[PDB]
Design a protein around this nucleic acid. Structure first.
Lengths: 49, 49
DNA sequence: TGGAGATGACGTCATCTCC
DNA sequence: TGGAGATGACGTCATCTCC
């Protein structure tokens, strides 16, 4: 059927978006963990001086 | 068939783990964004004083 | 070992959303 | 509006992994 054919592609596009969103999110946690470390270290330094 | 029955449940358990992992990850980004803000603000303060 | 479970992509159905 | 697309869960098959 036709509605099925269209839905099969809509599902394909939807899955693809969910896979990129996950990766995007995983990268962000990596980015924030590093930014966090530099600030935490920075705080210790300024605290001393 | 039997192997199919088992796989149908293995898939159910697997999906469940992927849903919790996503949520866990989403919470972490929220947590780090806030911790980041407090440190960034903290740095500005110590910088001044 | 061979064999069990885990997991990625698939296509489908049910629903929601949005004009 | 009614109708189009988006999306969550499903069950299946193919493969990987791990003893």
């Amino acid at each position: 059927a036709l509605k099925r054919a269209r839905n099969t592609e809509a599902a394909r596009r939807s899955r693809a978006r969910k896979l990129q969103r996950m990766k995007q999110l995983e990268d962000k946690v990596e980015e924030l963990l590093s930014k966090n470390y530099h600030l935490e270290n920075e705080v210790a330094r300024l605290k001393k001086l």
